[PDB]
Amino acid sequence: PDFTGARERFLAGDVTIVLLIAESHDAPYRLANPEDPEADLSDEQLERALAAYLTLVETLFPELYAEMKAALAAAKTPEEKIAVFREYNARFLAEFDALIDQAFARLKADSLTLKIHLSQGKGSYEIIFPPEVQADPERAAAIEALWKPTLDQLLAVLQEKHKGKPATTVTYEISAETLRAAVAALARAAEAALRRKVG
Amino acid sequence: PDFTGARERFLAGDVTIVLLIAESHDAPYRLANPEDPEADLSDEQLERALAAYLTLVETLFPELYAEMKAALAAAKTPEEKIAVFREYNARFLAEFDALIDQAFARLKADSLTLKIHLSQGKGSYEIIFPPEVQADPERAAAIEALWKPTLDQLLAVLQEKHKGKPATTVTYEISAETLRAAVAALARAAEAALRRKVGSLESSGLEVLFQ
Amino acid sequence: PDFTGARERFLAGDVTIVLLIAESHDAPYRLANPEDPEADLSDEQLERALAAYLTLVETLFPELYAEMKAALAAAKTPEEKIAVFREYNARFLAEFDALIDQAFARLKADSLTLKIHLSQGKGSYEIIFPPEVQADPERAAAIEALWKPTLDQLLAVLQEKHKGKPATTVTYEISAETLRAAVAALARAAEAALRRKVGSLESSGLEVLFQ
Amino acid sequence: PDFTGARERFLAGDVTIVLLIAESHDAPYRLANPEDPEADLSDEQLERALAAYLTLVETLFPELYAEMKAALAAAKTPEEKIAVFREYNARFLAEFDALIDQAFARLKADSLTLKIHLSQGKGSYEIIFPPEVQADPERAAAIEALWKPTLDQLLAVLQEKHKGKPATTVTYEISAETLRAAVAALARAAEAALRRKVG
């Protein structure tokens, strides 16, 4: 999947871009103990989290990403590389808090439910809209049409992962709070991966 | 008021230039029935709508305006002058649709509210940003920084128009749709004014009826 | 470079006019030893500092500049020209201190940082605001809108002097103290240059020499 | 106390202006249960909270205050007057968040302790600086000199309230967070008072 323009779509309200990025790497993001990732995650779980986190930062936050690349290259020791990563992740998470307020203000729904149904052929998805948007079928249709290209890519990614498998449904809550939690968990797992990668 | 750089600024998102041009001529543009200008506007109001329209076309599309002026000079009859005007006007309205699209893409806000408060001493302006920009202080600062030179001029103009008057507040809804409607209204009034100008009543001189 | 209105804008907070003037003359103003300028600077550098200093005085204090010009023309000897220059320079530095106090009182910021990024095509500028202005989007917008015409000119000058060179970043620390230090450095260099210009080697012509 | 120039002083870093306003009305602002003000405060404490909060709004945001008075005048029922007041309070508290960030950025100290010692004659005060300012005696002196006129008035107000009483020390923790909590508590007590006043 090509994430060019992804930042524009995200700010327009296509927040499931985050999910597409994570799922396209098959990264872990909804974690039981999202403070100790290495106690729950294997070496690809860590590697995949690192790659998904980096895609997310580069896509949503390209200037900070270039700065972070340079700062890490200039860092001389492993410990300094970890410290630099930690600082830039703090910056990235704060900036993401702002970006998520912007996207959920633009798209005028505070919380939605997304259900992905994977069955034998092509699957389907379903958005469960809040009561006020559900009362405006034509606003809700606008949101469906906005999310549709990303949701189609997400459906393809998931279907590739589930070939030959019994009927399965994946349920996401999409709100500022759950998306913040997903990105924080990705960041913590990515830090654990980087710690293993340097020194 | 200085309209140099106006095309570039408009493209960057300074869309209130349109308002400034209209208000500098005291032109009518938010018309109740914007389809028949003849019947709702006085001669001077039509007169001013035409002047504001010509300023807008020249400022935002100087090449098209030069062409239109030459083409009008070449037209010999009233009917040909009107048809030439309608042709260049359709061109200008299409180009302005494109320009509007670019400007609001560079603003990345769909709609804003602008309030101008006029009272006895110094007045002020107030931008009411949509919720997505209120959550983005850097965007709010950028939009205000782009708009502010134009808004200061607009405040000065209205400040002249309201001297000696009680506190009044003017509210502008700013979106691609309202600016398109304002410019369409200006174009319709300008066409009505031009028709009256090439008409026999005004275009035949005193010498032709021997005073 | 266009300096119309510069004095009023400076009082409103447009202090980077100083940088624009200095850079358009390629003058030295941030010197390691700002006490003996002739020990670090060539004759052409001293001359460029003199040209920049004169522009600055004329731009910000044109009445004072006319007075200084007349008194210099009336002075007959090198020594009197030096003395006249030193007197008017003290006056000018005194006014500049007052002007700077006013300008930074309007900015409501003690220090700002300006970064200019020059690359292959078009460069850019970036104003880095102090925390009290970062928390004030309205003030940040007012300052950007005021500074932008001067900054665009400064960017044009710098890109001209940097064609064909690798990516470069110029960082300006902007505060009452750094602007005072820059103007004081310009004044010292200009005095050294004027000393060389009014001496008989440069001042006396070939006719007096009897070629 | 004259609160002309108070807004200018506050923005310059003189945040104890808030304390002076509250204390000059003898208002409650450090509340045990700052969510239900009516359960701990007398009618007269409520009145003083309302008077202090309104002085604060008029001093720090006079345009919004003129608007709030006009909007209250236009509201016809008690319930609408309360709703208008709450809307404008939300506006004022958001504006105050921004103003407090400006004031503490100009102050160049993040958290301070102010101790006011009331004794028989004139009392005294003591500012306990954060460690980085304690190492810069000139910066500490600048902060002291900035706060001194306001602290002198505050000390006079407290000495009048404590005439003839044993030695007493009042401790204020001063930070963006404690000042925000104080103003929010005042606004909630003021709402309780207004509810009683219009019904």
PDB file of N, CA and C in Angstrom, chain A residues 85-172:
ATOM      1  N   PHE A  85      15.995   8.595  20.620  1.00  0.00           N
ATOM      2  CA  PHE A  85      14.739   8.013  20.163  1.00  0.00           C
ATOM      3  C   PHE A  85      13.612   8.340  21.132  1.00  0.00           C
ATOM      4  N   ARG A  86      13.863   8.167  22.436  1.00  0.00           N
ATOM      5  CA  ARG A  86      12.868   8.460  23.465  1.00  0.00           C
ATOM      6  C   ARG A  86      12.385   9.907  23.377  1.00  0.00           C
ATOM      7  N   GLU A  87      13.322  10.855  23.245  1.00  0.00           N
ATOM      8  CA  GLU A  87      12.930  12.264  23.162  1.00  0.00           C
ATOM      9  C   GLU A  87      12.073  12.531  21.935  1.00  0.00           C
ATOM     10  N   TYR A  88      12.496  12.022  20.781  1.00  0.00           N
ATOM     11  CA  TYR A  88      11.716  12.316  19.589  1.00  0.00           C
ATOM     12  C   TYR A  88      10.362  11.626  19.645  1.00  0.00           C
ATOM     13  N   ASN A  89      10.273  10.460  20.295  1.00  0.00           N
ATOM     14  CA  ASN A  89       8.969   9.808  20.441  1.00  0.00           C
ATOM     15  C   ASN A  89       8.055  10.635  21.327  1.00  0.00           C
ATOM     16  N   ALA A  90       8.602  11.257  22.377  1.00  0.00           N
ATOM     17  CA  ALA A  90       7.765  12.138  23.193  1.00  0.00           C
ATOM     18  C   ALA A  90       7.209  13.282  22.352  1.00  0.00           C
ATOM     19  N   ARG A  91       8.067  13.887  21.523  1.00  0.00           N
ATOM     20  CA  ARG A  91       7.618  14.946  20.616  1.00  0.00           C
ATOM     21  C   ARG A  91       6.556  14.430  19.645  1.00  0.00           C
ATOM     22  N   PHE A  92       6.801  13.257  19.068  1.00  0.00           N
ATOM     23  CA  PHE A  92       5.881  12.701  18.091  1.00  0.00           C
ATOM     24  C   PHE A  92       4.527  12.408  18.713  1.00  0.00           C
ATOM     25  N   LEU A  93       4.506  11.831  19.920  1.00  0.00           N
ATOM     26  CA  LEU A  93       3.233  11.514  20.561  1.00  0.00           C
ATOM     27  C   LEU A  93       2.449  12.784  20.898  1.00  0.00           C
ATOM     28  N   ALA A  94       3.133  13.841  21.364  1.00  0.00           N
ATOM     29  CA  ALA A  94       2.421  15.092  21.664  1.00  0.00           C
ATOM     30  C   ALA A  94       1.806  15.681  20.398  1.00  0.00           C
ATOM     31  N   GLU A  95       2.601  15.718  19.330  1.00  0.00           N
ATOM     32  CA  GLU A  95       2.121  16.208  18.049  1.00  0.00           C
ATOM     33  C   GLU A  95       0.958  15.354  17.520  1.00  0.00           C
ATOM     34  N   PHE A  96       0.995  14.045  17.774  1.00  0.00           N
ATOM     35  CA  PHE A  96      -0.090  13.175  17.344  1.00  0.00           C
ATOM     36  C   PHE A  96      -1.364  13.458  18.129  1.00  0.00           C
ATOM     37  N   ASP A  97      -1.235  13.782  19.417  1.00  0.00           N
ATOM     38  CA  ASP A  97      -2.404  14.210  20.190  1.00  0.00           C
ATOM     39  C   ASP A  97      -3.110  15.380  19.498  1.00  0.00           C
ATOM     40  N   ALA A  98      -2.320  16.372  19.077  1.00  0.00           N
ATOM     41  CA  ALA A  98      -2.897  17.496  18.333  1.00  0.00           C
ATOM     42  C   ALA A  98      -3.502  17.048  16.995  1.00  0.00           C
ATOM     43  N   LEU A  99      -2.772  16.231  16.233  1.00  0.00           N
ATOM     44  CA  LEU A  99      -3.287  15.806  14.929  1.00  0.00           C
ATOM     45  C   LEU A  99      -4.608  15.047  15.061  1.00  0.00           C
ATOM     46  N   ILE A 100      -4.778  14.296  16.155  1.00  0.00           N
ATOM     47  CA  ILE A 100      -5.995  13.509  16.349  1.00  0.00           C
ATOM     48  C   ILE A 100      -7.161  14.417  16.753  1.00  0.00           C
ATOM     49  N   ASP A 101      -6.900  15.430  17.593  1.00  0.00           N
ATOM     50  CA  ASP A 101      -7.927  16.447  17.830  1.00  0.00           C
ATOM     51  C   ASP A 101      -8.366  17.099  16.518  1.00  0.00           C
ATOM     52  N   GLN A 102      -7.418  17.399  15.627  1.00  0.00           N
ATOM     53  CA  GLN A 102      -7.798  18.005  14.352  1.00  0.00           C
ATOM     54  C   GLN A 102      -8.677  17.071  13.518  1.00  0.00           C
ATOM     55  N   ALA A 103      -8.286  15.795  13.414  1.00  0.00           N
ATOM     56  CA  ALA A 103      -9.032  14.869  12.560  1.00  0.00           C
ATOM     57  C   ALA A 103     -10.439  14.601  13.107  1.00  0.00           C
ATOM     58  N   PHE A 104     -10.574  14.426  14.420  1.00  0.00           N
ATOM     59  CA  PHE A 104     -11.893  14.182  14.988  1.00  0.00           C
ATOM     60  C   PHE A 104     -12.746  15.442  15.076  1.00  0.00           C
ATOM     61  N   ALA A 105     -12.142  16.631  15.033  1.00  0.00           N
ATOM     62  CA  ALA A 105     -12.954  17.825  14.844  1.00  0.00           C
ATOM     63  C   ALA A 105     -13.481  17.895  13.415  1.00  0.00           C
ATOM     64  N   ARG A 106     -12.624  17.618  12.436  1.00  0.00           N
ATOM     65  CA  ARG A 106     -13.038  17.675  11.045  1.00  0.00           C
ATOM     66  C   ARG A 106     -14.149  16.677  10.753  1.00  0.00           C
ATOM     67  N   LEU A 107     -13.830  15.384  10.783  1.00  0.00           N
ATOM     68  CA  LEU A 107     -14.881  14.376  10.824  1.00  0.00           C
ATOM     69  C   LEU A 107     -15.644  14.582  12.122  1.00  0.00           C
ATOM     70  N   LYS A 108     -16.950  14.781  12.032  1.00  0.00           N
ATOM     71  CA  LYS A 108     -17.711  15.258  13.190  1.00  0.00           C
ATOM     72  C   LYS A 108     -18.338  14.132  14.007  1.00  0.00           C
ATOM     73  N   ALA A 109     -17.612  13.036  14.217  1.00  0.00           N
ATOM     74  CA  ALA A 109     -18.043  11.977  15.119  1.00  0.00           C
ATOM     75  C   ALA A 109     -16.952  11.693  16.145  1.00  0.00           C
ATOM     76  N   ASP A 110     -17.372  11.547  17.407  1.00  0.00           N
ATOM     77  CA  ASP A 110     -16.437  11.363  18.512  1.00  0.00           C
ATOM     78  C   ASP A 110     -15.990   9.907  18.661  1.00  0.00           C
ATOM     79  N   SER A 111     -16.872   8.945  18.395  1.00  0.00           N
ATOM     80  CA  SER A 111     -16.497   7.543  18.511  1.00  0.00           C
ATOM     81  C   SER A 111     -17.354   6.731  17.552  1.00  0.00           C
ATOM     82  N   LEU A 112     -16.715   5.792  16.855  1.00  0.00           N
ATOM     83  CA  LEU A 112     -17.393   4.917  15.910  1.00  0.00           C
ATOM     84  C   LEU A 112     -16.910   3.497  16.125  1.00  0.00           C
ATOM     85  N   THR A 113     -17.714   2.541  15.669  1.00  0.00           N
ATOM     86  CA  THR A 113     -17.328   1.135  15.723  1.00  0.00           C
ATOM     87  C   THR A 113     -17.138   0.638  14.296  1.00  0.00           C
ATOM     88  N   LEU A 114     -16.037  -0.063  14.031  1.00  0.00           N
ATOM     89  CA  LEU A 114     -15.760  -0.638  12.719  1.00  0.00           C
ATOM     90  C   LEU A 114     -15.657  -2.150  12.861  1.00  0.00           C
ATOM     91  N   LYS A 115     -16.458  -2.870  12.091  1.00  0.00           N
ATOM     92  CA  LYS A 115     -16.450  -4.324  12.108  1.00  0.00           C
ATOM     93  C   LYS A 115     -16.030  -4.802  10.732  1.00  0.00           C
ATOM     94  N   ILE A 116     -15.020  -5.657  10.687  1.00  0.00           N
ATOM     95  CA  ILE A 116     -14.526  -6.254   9.455  1.00  0.00           C
ATOM     96  C   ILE A 116     -14.875  -7.727   9.502  1.00  0.00           C
ATOM     97  N   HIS A 117     -15.621  -8.176   8.501  1.00  0.00           N
ATOM     98  CA  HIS A 117     -16.073  -9.554   8.373  1.00  0.00           C
ATOM     99  C   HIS A 117     -15.271 -10.213   7.258  1.00  0.00           C
ATOM    100  N   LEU A 118     -14.466 -11.197   7.624  1.00  0.00           N
ATOM    101  CA  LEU A 118     -13.691 -11.972   6.679  1.00  0.00           C
ATOM    102  C   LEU A 118     -14.357 -13.333   6.562  1.00  0.00           C
ATOM    103  N   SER A 119     -14.806 -13.658   5.347  1.00  0.00           N
ATOM    104  CA  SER A 119     -15.403 -14.939   4.994  1.00  0.00           C
ATOM    105  C   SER A 119     -14.779 -15.410   3.686  1.00  0.00           C
ATOM    106  N   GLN A 120     -15.331 -16.474   3.093  1.00  0.00           N
ATOM    107  CA  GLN A 120     -14.622 -17.246   2.071  1.00  0.00           C
ATOM    108  C   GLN A 120     -14.068 -16.380   0.938  1.00  0.00           C
ATOM    109  N   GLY A 121     -14.893 -15.514   0.360  1.00  0.00           N
ATOM    110  CA  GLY A 121     -14.421 -14.705  -0.750  1.00  0.00           C
ATOM    111  C   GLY A 121     -13.884 -13.355  -0.326  1.00  0.00           C
ATOM    112  N   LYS A 122     -14.462 -12.290  -0.868  1.00  0.00           N
ATOM    113  CA  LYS A 122     -14.184 -10.959  -0.359  1.00  0.00           C
ATOM    114  C   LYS A 122     -15.069 -10.747   0.858  1.00  0.00           C
ATOM    115  N   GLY A 123     -14.515 -10.117   1.871  1.00  0.00           N
ATOM    116  CA  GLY A 123     -15.254  -9.777   3.063  1.00  0.00           C
ATOM    117  C   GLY A 123     -15.963  -8.454   2.930  1.00  0.00           C
ATOM    118  N   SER A 124     -16.379  -7.935   4.071  1.00  0.00           N
ATOM    119  CA  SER A 124     -17.121  -6.691   4.099  1.00  0.00           C
ATOM    120  C   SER A 124     -16.765  -5.960   5.383  1.00  0.00           C
ATOM    121  N   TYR A 125     -17.155  -4.693   5.453  1.00  0.00           N
ATOM    122  CA  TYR A 125     -17.019  -3.924   6.676  1.00  0.00           C
ATOM    123  C   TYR A 125     -18.305  -3.169   6.973  1.00  0.00           C
ATOM    124  N   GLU A 126     -18.410  -2.720   8.218  1.00  0.00           N
ATOM    125  CA  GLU A 126     -19.595  -2.056   8.741  1.00  0.00           C
ATOM    126  C   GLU A 126     -19.173  -0.977   9.731  1.00  0.00           C
ATOM    127  N   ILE A 127     -19.647   0.250   9.536  1.00  0.00           N
ATOM    128  CA  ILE A 127     -19.423   1.345  10.474  1.00  0.00           C
ATOM    129  C   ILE A 127     -20.689   1.515  11.291  1.00  0.00           C
ATOM    130  N   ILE A 128     -20.563   1.469  12.603  1.00  0.00           N
ATOM    131  CA  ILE A 128     -21.669   1.759  13.497  1.00  0.00           C
ATOM    132  C   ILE A 128     -21.434   3.180  13.986  1.00  0.00           C
ATOM    133  N   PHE A 129     -22.277   4.100  13.474  1.00  0.00           N
ATOM    134  CA  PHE A 129     -22.215   5.542  13.654  1.00  0.00           C
ATOM    135  C   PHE A 129     -22.863   5.929  14.979  1.00  0.00           C
ATOM    136  N   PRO A 130     -22.423   7.026  15.585  1.00  0.00           N
ATOM    137  CA  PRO A 130     -23.095   7.530  16.795  1.00  0.00           C
ATOM    138  C   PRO A 130     -24.505   7.990  16.470  1.00  0.00           C
ATOM    139  N   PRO A 131     -25.376   8.129  17.479  1.00  0.00           N
ATOM    140  CA  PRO A 131     -26.794   8.428  17.178  1.00  0.00           C
ATOM    141  C   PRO A 131     -27.021   9.678  16.333  1.00  0.00           C
ATOM    142  N   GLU A 132     -26.272  10.761  16.583  1.00  0.00           N
ATOM    143  CA  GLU A 132     -26.476  12.000  15.833  1.00  0.00           C
ATOM    144  C   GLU A 132     -26.060  11.878  14.368  1.00  0.00           C
ATOM    145  N   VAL A 133     -25.033  11.084  14.061  1.00  0.00           N
ATOM    146  CA  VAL A 133     -24.653  10.933  12.660  1.00  0.00           C
ATOM    147  C   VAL A 133     -25.563   9.927  11.978  1.00  0.00           C
ATOM    148  N   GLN A 134     -25.988   8.910  12.722  1.00  0.00           N
ATOM    149  CA  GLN A 134     -26.931   7.927  12.214  1.00  0.00           C
ATOM    150  C   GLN A 134     -28.254   8.571  11.807  1.00  0.00           C
ATOM    151  N   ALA A 135     -28.599   9.706  12.420  1.00  0.00           N
ATOM    152  CA  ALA A 135     -29.803  10.446  12.071  1.00  0.00           C
ATOM    153  C   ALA A 135     -29.653  11.287  10.803  1.00  0.00           C
ATOM    154  N   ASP A 136     -28.472  11.318  10.181  1.00  0.00           N
ATOM    155  CA  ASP A 136     -28.178  12.166   9.020  1.00  0.00           C
ATOM    156  C   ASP A 136     -27.590  11.244   7.960  1.00  0.00           C
ATOM    157  N   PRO A 137     -28.433  10.440   7.288  1.00  0.00           N
ATOM    158  CA  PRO A 137     -27.927   9.303   6.484  1.00  0.00           C
ATOM    159  C   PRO A 137     -26.904   9.711   5.469  1.00  0.00           C
ATOM    160  N   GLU A 138     -27.134  10.922   4.983  1.00  0.00           N
ATOM    161  CA  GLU A 138     -26.318  11.638   4.000  1.00  0.00           C
ATOM    162  C   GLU A 138     -25.006  12.215   4.549  1.00  0.00           C
ATOM    163  N   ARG A 139     -24.950  12.685   5.802  1.00  0.00           N
ATOM    164  CA  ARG A 139     -23.640  12.888   6.424  1.00  0.00           C
ATOM    165  C   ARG A 139     -22.903  11.552   6.634  1.00  0.00           C
ATOM    166  N   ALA A 140     -23.602  10.527   7.153  1.00  0.00           N
ATOM    167  CA  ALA A 140     -22.974   9.222   7.356  1.00  0.00           C
ATOM    168  C   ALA A 140     -22.452   8.650   6.042  1.00  0.00           C
ATOM    169  N   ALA A 141     -23.202   8.843   4.961  1.00  0.00           N
ATOM    170  CA  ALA A 141     -22.727   8.394   3.662  1.00  0.00           C
ATOM    171  C   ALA A 141     -21.455   9.136   3.286  1.00  0.00           C
ATOM    172  N   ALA A 142     -21.370  10.426   3.643  1.00  0.00           N
ATOM    173  CA  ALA A 142     -20.142  11.161   3.365  1.00  0.00           C
ATOM    174  C   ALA A 142     -18.954  10.517   4.082  1.00  0.00           C
ATOM    175  N   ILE A 143     -19.143  10.138   5.351  1.00  0.00           N
ATOM    176  CA  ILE A 143     -18.053   9.486   6.089  1.00  0.00           C
ATOM    177  C   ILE A 143     -17.697   8.140   5.457  1.00  0.00           C
ATOM    178  N   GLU A 144     -18.708   7.351   5.094  1.00  0.00           N
ATOM    179  CA  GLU A 144     -18.429   6.070   4.456  1.00  0.00           C
ATOM    180  C   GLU A 144     -17.593   6.269   3.199  1.00  0.00           C
ATOM    181  N   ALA A 145     -17.969   7.252   2.371  1.00  0.00           N
ATOM    182  CA  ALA A 145     -17.254   7.474   1.119  1.00  0.00           C
ATOM    183  C   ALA A 145     -15.839   7.959   1.383  1.00  0.00           C
ATOM    184  N   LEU A 146     -15.652   8.737   2.451  1.00  0.00           N
ATOM    185  CA  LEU A 146     -14.311   9.178   2.824  1.00  0.00           C
ATOM    186  C   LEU A 146     -13.434   8.001   3.247  1.00  0.00           C
ATOM    187  N   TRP A 147     -13.955   7.125   4.118  1.00  0.00           N
ATOM    188  CA  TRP A 147     -13.158   6.026   4.653  1.00  0.00           C
ATOM    189  C   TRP A 147     -12.953   4.926   3.633  1.00  0.00           C
ATOM    190  N   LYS A 148     -13.808   4.867   2.619  1.00  0.00           N
ATOM    191  CA  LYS A 148     -13.874   3.683   1.766  1.00  0.00           C
ATOM    192  C   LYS A 148     -12.552   3.277   1.129  1.00  0.00           C
ATOM    193  N   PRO A 149     -11.755   4.165   0.508  1.00  0.00           N
ATOM    194  CA  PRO A 149     -10.507   3.667  -0.115  1.00  0.00           C
ATOM    195  C   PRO A 149      -9.568   2.999   0.877  1.00  0.00           C
ATOM    196  N   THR A 150      -9.411   3.609   2.041  1.00  0.00           N
ATOM    197  CA  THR A 150      -8.573   3.035   3.082  1.00  0.00           C
ATOM    198  C   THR A 150      -9.156   1.733   3.600  1.00  0.00           C
ATOM    199  N   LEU A 151     -10.462   1.709   3.870  1.00  0.00           N
ATOM    200  CA  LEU A 151     -11.074   0.484   4.367  1.00  0.00           C
ATOM    201  C   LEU A 151     -10.969  -0.637   3.333  1.00  0.00           C
ATOM    202  N   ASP A 152     -11.066  -0.309   2.041  1.00  0.00           N
ATOM    203  CA  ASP A 152     -10.869  -1.332   1.018  1.00  0.00           C
ATOM    204  C   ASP A 152      -9.454  -1.889   1.060  1.00  0.00           C
ATOM    205  N   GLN A 153      -8.456  -1.017   1.236  1.00  0.00           N
ATOM    206  CA  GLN A 153      -7.091  -1.525   1.351  1.00  0.00           C
ATOM    207  C   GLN A 153      -6.931  -2.367   2.613  1.00  0.00           C
ATOM    208  N   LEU A 154      -7.507  -1.907   3.718  1.00  0.00           N
ATOM    209  CA  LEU A 154      -7.419  -2.656   4.964  1.00  0.00           C
ATOM    210  C   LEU A 154      -8.081  -4.024   4.811  1.00  0.00           C
ATOM    211  N   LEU A 155      -9.233  -4.068   4.140  1.00  0.00           N
ATOM    212  CA  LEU A 155      -9.914  -5.335   3.889  1.00  0.00           C
ATOM    213  C   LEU A 155      -9.045  -6.265   3.051  1.00  0.00           C
ATOM    214  N   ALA A 156      -8.394  -5.742   2.006  1.00  0.00           N
ATOM    215  CA  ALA A 156      -7.497  -6.587   1.213  1.00  0.00           C
ATOM    216  C   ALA A 156      -6.333  -7.125   2.053  1.00  0.00           C
ATOM    217  N   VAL A 157      -5.713  -6.257   2.853  1.00  0.00           N
ATOM    218  CA  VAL A 157      -4.595  -6.686   3.696  1.00  0.00           C
ATOM    219  C   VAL A 157      -5.040  -7.806   4.637  1.00  0.00           C
ATOM    220  N   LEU A 158      -6.191  -7.611   5.292  1.00  0.00           N
ATOM    221  CA  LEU A 158      -6.676  -8.615   6.230  1.00  0.00           C
ATOM    222  C   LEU A 158      -7.035  -9.910   5.512  1.00  0.00           C
ATOM    223  N   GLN A 159      -7.642  -9.812   4.324  1.00  0.00           N
ATOM    224  CA  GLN A 159      -8.029 -11.021   3.602  1.00  0.00           C
ATOM    225  C   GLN A 159      -6.813 -11.822   3.194  1.00  0.00           C
ATOM    226  N   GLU A 160      -5.740 -11.136   2.792  1.00  0.00           N
ATOM    227  CA  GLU A 160      -4.506 -11.851   2.506  1.00  0.00           C
ATOM    228  C   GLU A 160      -4.031 -12.582   3.748  1.00  0.00           C
ATOM    229  N   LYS A 161      -4.170 -11.949   4.918  1.00  0.00           N
ATOM    230  CA  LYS A 161      -3.713 -12.617   6.132  1.00  0.00           C
ATOM    231  C   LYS A 161      -4.599 -13.788   6.556  1.00  0.00           C
ATOM    232  N   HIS A 162      -5.815 -13.919   6.018  1.00  0.00           N
ATOM    233  CA  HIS A 162      -6.778 -14.897   6.523  1.00  0.00           C
ATOM    234  C   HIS A 162      -7.217 -15.890   5.455  1.00  0.00           C
ATOM    235  N   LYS A 163      -6.388 -16.136   4.438  1.00  0.00           N
ATOM    236  CA  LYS A 163      -6.798 -17.010   3.341  1.00  0.00           C
ATOM    237  C   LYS A 163      -7.060 -18.423   3.852  1.00  0.00           C
ATOM    238  N   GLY A 164      -8.178 -18.999   3.423  1.00  0.00           N
ATOM    239  CA  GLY A 164      -8.500 -20.359   3.799  1.00  0.00           C
ATOM    240  C   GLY A 164      -9.005 -20.528   5.208  1.00  0.00           C
ATOM    241  N   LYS A 165      -9.421 -19.425   5.877  1.00  0.00           N
ATOM    242  CA  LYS A 165      -9.739 -19.478   7.293  1.00  0.00           C
ATOM    243  C   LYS A 165     -11.243 -19.366   7.534  1.00  0.00           C
ATOM    244  N   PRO A 166     -11.733 -19.910   8.644  1.00  0.00           N
ATOM    245  CA  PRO A 166     -13.162 -19.795   8.958  1.00  0.00           C
ATOM    246  C   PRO A 166     -13.573 -18.349   9.170  1.00  0.00           C
ATOM    247  N   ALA A 167     -14.886 -18.127   9.112  1.00  0.00           N
ATOM    248  CA  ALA A 167     -15.454 -16.800   9.283  1.00  0.00           C
ATOM    249  C   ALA A 167     -14.912 -16.141  10.538  1.00  0.00           C
ATOM    250  N   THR A 168     -14.405 -14.923  10.368  1.00  0.00           N
ATOM    251  CA  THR A 168     -13.839 -14.171  11.470  1.00  0.00           C
ATOM    252  C   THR A 168     -14.275 -12.714  11.374  1.00  0.00           C
ATOM    253  N   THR A 169     -14.538 -12.102  12.522  1.00  0.00           N
ATOM    254  CA  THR A 169     -14.868 -10.679  12.571  1.00  0.00           C
ATOM    255  C   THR A 169     -13.938  -9.969  13.538  1.00  0.00           C
ATOM    256  N   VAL A 170     -13.373  -8.858  13.077  1.00  0.00           N
ATOM    257  CA  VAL A 170     -12.502  -7.994  13.861  1.00  0.00           C
ATOM    258  C   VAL A 170     -13.253  -6.700  14.148  1.00  0.00           C
ATOM    259  N   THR A 171     -13.325  -6.325  15.431  1.00  0.00           N
ATOM    260  CA  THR A 171     -14.020  -5.126  15.901  1.00  0.00           C
ATOM    261  C   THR A 171     -13.019  -4.118  16.448  1.00  0.00           C
ATOM    262  N   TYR A 172     -13.044  -2.950  15.851  1.00  0.00           N
ATOM    263  CA  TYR A 172     -12.278  -1.805  16.288  1.00  0.00           C
ATOM    264  C   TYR A 172     -13.252  -0.753  16.814  1.00  0.00           C
TER     265      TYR A 172
END
